[PDB]
Every structure is written in structure tokens, then in C-alpha cells.
Amino acid sequence: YDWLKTVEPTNFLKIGLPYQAHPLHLQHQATTPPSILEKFKRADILLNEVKAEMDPLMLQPETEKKLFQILSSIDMFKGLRKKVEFTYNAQIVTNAWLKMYELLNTMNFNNTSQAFCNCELPGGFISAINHFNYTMMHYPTFNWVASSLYPEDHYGLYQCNPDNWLMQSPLLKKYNNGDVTIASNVKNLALRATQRLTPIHLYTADGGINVYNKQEELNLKLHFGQALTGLLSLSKGGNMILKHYTLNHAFTLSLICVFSHFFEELYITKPTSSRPTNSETYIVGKNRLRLFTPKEEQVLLKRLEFFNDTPLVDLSLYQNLLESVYFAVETIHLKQQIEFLNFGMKCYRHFYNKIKLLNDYLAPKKKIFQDRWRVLNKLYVLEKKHKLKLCA
């Protein structure tokens, strides 16, 4: 099992996207797509094919249990959350906490002080920024608004902190339930957010549904409201962190195209704390250069209002940017993710009946990787006076 003993830690994956000097026209017709879309389409079929390879295991509950066991066993960062939570006084240290924390430590944000964290429940992202802010930035006070589809708040971050969340309980249907697929909710959330916290230097949105062959597609309207909320609230100079997945659909591509008009730097990122076997990505915009015009605002909300995945811009005008995206898709999905799904199927085959053994083989490797993470994203102990109030 040498192939096991040689597994190496992943690297943080960061792919720069070019800003578009040119003025942004939001399309109202369909345009013939550029050739390169066939390439993204070829990536979608391939990535979907490898994923399919676990289909046979998903038919009997027995093999499906062994499948998740095997996936658990290969998760090199598993007991890191608990090490982090204890060693350093951290809170809501979900896997989301590590991702946001890793993002904070890599991206060199110019500012992380005024955070609007949307699709945030429970609140790992919020906790990560609180902790990073008070132990690394030392911002005198840290102010944040949050919102999420009202259901979960396992830790009582919504219950204890109601002057910060922007969505209502059903008992208020009378009303914004934090659902970012309703256009009127996104307008309202952005307004609320900018109504009690100015400016907004950091917007984050970690939304997703779950189900894999149409995961991106199922999530388009969600990832569009997510981003509409941000772009309607993020103040000039502010920063942005958005959860995406595959990035092969022409809408997603056109959405990234919109973004490239609004930041000094734009990147597609795959943090080591993002499972290497899933398609999760984090689009990251540093230094917002300008706000929406009043026309740009209306066109996008109406598209949210009456939604179709037709591209928002003429993709042919963004050839260079598109070549950069595919390069992230080649790096994150066609290589890394496919390399790691193959690796997990291989493990499954040689260890479906020997889980304990696989875990024994990988213990040394695990400690080294979690240790590396901690040395890469230095963590300090959070002062109890700077902790978030939790009701659970």
C-alpha cells in the first residue's frame, strides 16, 4: 500500500482572474456562445462521469455505509476542528470555520472589520472572522450583520444575537425570511444590512442546496441571489467571499464575468480545508472598485425576479477571463477533485472490508497535515471577552 504512504498534503488553490477594463453591458438577448464553452461543457461531462463511478455503491445501503466510512477515513483534516476549538478557544468550529479562517490567512484582505455574512446559519464563517479579527487584526470592536434562510442555529448565534440577524421567524409572515432567491428579499436584506452597519468591508455568502450531476444548476438561482445581496451591500473597497461549485454552466461563467467589472483582484479558490473530493469553490473579490449604477441594479434584480440561466453578458467579450476560469476548473476539478475521487474509490476497493486498517495507515499522515494547516494559518487563543454570545 505504498500509494497510501506517499499521499501528500494539498496546496491552497488560488487562480487569478483578469479585471475587465471595459464597461459592462448586461445582455437582454441571447448571443452565440464562444467556442470555449464546449470546453467547459466537456469538463462538466467528465467531472459528472467520475462522480458517477460511485453510483454502484449507492444502490445497496450496505455498500453505501462502507462508502462513507471510506470517505471519512480519507478525510485528512477530520480531528482538526476539535483540536482548533480547544487549543485556541474557538467557536462554531465547523468545517466552514476552517475554510473561512484559511481564506482570511491567505487572501490578504485589506480589511475584515464590517462583515455581512449571508446564508450563514449556523455561523462558522462569522465565528472565524470574529476570531481572526480579535486575534490577528486587533480591530477595536468588530461589527457584523448576518442573515440565512429562516428554518439551523445549532449554537444559538441567531437566538442570542438578534440585533445582528436580518431575517424574521415565520411568526412574522405578516417580512423577509432570508431566502435569497426572492428578489424582494435580496433588496431588503441589502438595505437592512446597509441600514445598521456602514460601511460593509466584507461580504460572505456560503449558500448551497444539496441533493450531484445538476448541483451547480440546482444552485444557480441561489448563488445569484447570494451575489446580488453582496453587490447591493458591499461598499467601495470592500471584500467578497462567495461559495460556488463546478463553474461550468454559462450562467455561472456570466456571473463571474459581471464580478470582474467590480474588483481590483478576483480569484477562484479551493482552500485545503474545502473537501478535495467535492466541487466546492470560493470566488473571492478584493477591493471593490465601484458600486452598481441604478440601471445595473434594476436589471439584475429583475433577472432574479424572473430567472433564467441565460448568460447575463456576452461571453464572447470575456475570452481571456474565460480561459482563466477553465484554468481553475482544470486545476480544481479536472485534476485535483478527480485525482481524489479516484483515490477514494481505490481505497474503497482495497479497504471496503478493512476500514480500521486504512485509518491506522493514515494516522501519521493525518497529524502531519493538520499540523501543517496550523503552521500555515497561525492561530492564537481567543480572549473570552471577545467571544460571540451563543445560546446553545
Ligand X SMILES: C[S@@+](CC[C@H](N)C(=O)[O-])C[C@H]1O[C@@H](n2cnc3c(N)ncnc32)[C@H](O)[C@@H]1O
Active site residues: 243
DSSP assignment of 168-224, as one string? --GGG-------TTSHHHHHHHHHHHHHSSSS--EEEE-------TTHHHHTHHHHH
207 is in an annotated binding site: no
Q: Is residue 124 involved in binding ligand X (CB under 6 A)?
A: yes
Is 277 annotated to bind ligand?
no
Residue 255 near residue 223 (C-beta atoms within 8 A): yes
Beta strand pairing call for 239-244 and 281-288: antiparallel
- On whether 325 is known to bind a ligand per the annotation, the reply is no
Residue 47's contacts (CB-CB under 8 Å, 6 or more residues apart) are 246, 248, 279, 333, 334, 337, 338
In the stretch 41-80, what mask flags binding to ligand X with x, by CB under 6 A? ----------------------------------------
C-beta of 217 vs 330, nearer to ligand X: 217
Comparison of 43 and 92: residue with beta carbon closer to ligand X: 92
CB of 93 to ligand X, least distance (A): 10
Q: Does 179 bind ligand X (CB under 6 A)?
A: yes
Q: Is 19 in the site for ligand X (CB under 6 A)?
A: no
Our finding on whether 178 is near ligand X (CB under 6 A) is yes
Map residue 319 onto helix, strand or coil: helix
Q: Would you say 247 or 362 has its CB closer to ligand X?
A: 247
Among 37, 121, 197, 321, binds ligand X (CB under 6 A): 121
Site for ligand X in 189-208 (CB under 6 A): 206-208
Q: Which is nearer to ligand X, 158 or 326 (CB)?
A: 158
**Which amino acid appears at position 65 of this protein?**
K
User: Sheet harboring 114-118: ordered strands across?
Assistant: 13-17, 263-270, 281-288, 239-244, 202-205, 114-118, 143-146
Q: How many residues lie near ligand X (CB under 6 A)?
A: 20
Residue 47 grid cell: 467531472
Question: CB of 139: closest distance to ligand X in angstroms?
Answer: 20
Set of cell numbers at residue 214:
445538476
Q: Residue 239: which of 208, 264, 273, 271 has the closest Cα?
A: 264
Q: 118 — phi, psi (to 5°)? A: -100, 165
Task: Give me the least distance between CB of 96 and ligand X, in Å please.
Answer: 4
> For residues 91-120, which are near ligand X according to CB under 6 A?
94, 96, 119-120
List residues bridging with 145 in a β-sheet.
116
Which of 33, 34, 122, 311 is the binder for ligand X (CB under 6 A)? Answer: 122
Question: Applying CB under 6 A, which of residues 33, 34, 123, 344 lies at the interface with ligand X?
Answer: 123
With binding defined as CB under 6 A, does residue 271 bind ligand X? no
Binding residues for ligand X, rule: CB under 6 A, are 94, 96, 119-125, 148-149, 178-181, 206-209, 222
